[PDB]
């Protein structure tokens, strides 16, 4: 029950903040020309990341929850812009040359930069960053969906999964281990580590391979199915060792044409 004046003050402040954000976003629209195109009408900023996806960033001036994360993140992003303006990082530690970024110094005497390192300081916009996240959330959703749907439709070699407990704004990671229904301990090859990133899924295979799946879903369907077949054929060898048999063994890849 904070004083009535504070409610009106805070409401007005939030209104100004979201006006400022949408202004910045609408600016970036006609600006840097993201690789994906985007329409701005008057209060809705419609864009397409990966096709069949329409991200709408709107401003509901009166008088979802996927994008709720996206909204609360956008807020922090714009406030990070503001803070970047006025911050100690700008402040010089020696009573000396002007208000450089505390790194533009080290870009000097410490011979620091080639094109890449110097360029690491330039900025990457506001719509481009949020577009990134939106894509990331979606991608992640598509991968989780296709892996779990694969799990639903087989009941032969079980596709166990274990996402990580540290999911950064850019890139996420998960582990997928396919095992046989009972024999787990005994048999465990066919293990992967997806790195779901914006627009690409990097797969690292226990055997030592590194495949870079595209953003589609049929691709992950296919890769996981290939691993399921390989796993049956690996589990038979593991079992033959488990006890009792000598192996005139396989080709992982070929069979015999």
């Amino acid at each position: 029950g904070s004083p009535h004046w504070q409610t009106k003050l805070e409401a007005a402040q939030n209104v100004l903040l979201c006006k400022e954000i949408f202004a910045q976003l609408s600016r970036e629209a006609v600006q840097i020309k993201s690789q994906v195109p985007h329409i701005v009408v008057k209060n809705q900023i419609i864009s397409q990341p990966f096709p069949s996806l329409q991200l709408s960033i709107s401003l509901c001036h009166s008088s979802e929850d996927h994008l709720y994360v996206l909204e609360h993140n956008l807020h922090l992003l714009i406030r990070e812009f503001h803070k970047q303006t006025l911050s100690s990082i700008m402040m010089p530690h020696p009573a000396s040359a002007p208000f450089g970024h505390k790194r533009m110094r080290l870009s000097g005497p410490q011979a620091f930069d080639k094109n890449e390192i110097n360029s690491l300081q330039s900025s990457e916009g506001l719509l481009e960053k949020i577009i990134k996240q939106a894509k990331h959330i979606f991608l992640r959703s598509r991968a989780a969906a296709t892996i779990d749907s694969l799990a639903s439709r087989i009941e032969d070699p079980q596709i166990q999964a274990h996402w990580s407990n540290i999911n950064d704004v850019y890139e996420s990671s998960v582990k997928v281990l396919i095992t046989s229904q009972g024999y787990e301990q005994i048999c465990k090859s066919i293990q992967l580590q997806l790195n779901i990133g914006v627009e690409q899924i990097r797969v690292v295979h226990r055997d030592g391979r590194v495949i870079t799946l595209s953003y589609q879903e049929q691709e992950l369907q296919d890769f996981l199915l290939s691993q399921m077949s390989q796993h049956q054929v690996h589990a038979v060898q593991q079992l033959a060792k488990v006890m009792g048999w000598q192996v005139l063994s396989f080709s992982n890849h070929v069979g015999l044409g």
């Binding site: 994360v69 993140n73 922090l76 779990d148 407990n165 999911n167 950064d168 996420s172």
Partner: peptide
């Protein structure tokens, strides 16, 4: 159970996104 696991996954992704952001 899988609905529950999905809900928890979403919450964990979300909470991670935020905190790791700031």
């Amino acid at each position: 159970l899988k609905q529950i696991m999905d809900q928890l996954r979403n919450l964990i992704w979300d909470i991670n996104a935020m905190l790791a952001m700031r």
